[PDB]
């Protein structure tokens with residue numbers, strides 16, 4: 001039984017808050033949160049989701065308001081049943097932080113051909129559109145399996 005899901009990216013301002021809120025809307029009886037591998041080093045802790053990420057999600061009827069970026073820690077990992085990373089490369093960075101969490105760590109895009117979800121940060125709204133499309137397709141697949 002996977003009830004608590006942690007969506008992980010690097011800053012926790014773009015992809016991972018979007019994935020959190022998209023999955024949360026699809027799985028209302030589950031607890032979905034998100035965290036960033038380098039949120040602390042990037043000085044992003046407490047920051048809201050990127051304005052374009054909020055805007056694009058809003059246009060797809062998903063609320064990414066009231067988000068606060070947080071750092072991924074071993075303690076945080078122990079609280080969640082399933083961990084979903086945005087890129088395959090994030091796994092090595094995750095294991096460095098929480099080696100014990102590798103067993104429950106999977107790819108957000110696992111069921112859509114194990115696709116990595118590209119970072120739209122610092123780019124135009126079109127890049128955020130692209131990322132949302134992939135996150136949406138990926139989350140819809142996870143929801144069918146959970």
Ligand SMILES: O=P(O)(O)Cc1ccccc1
Pocket residue numbers: 009010011012013014015016036042044119120121
């Ligand atoms: O939260 P994301 O989607 O990784 C965007 C981002 C945020 C900070 C540093 C790099 C990339």
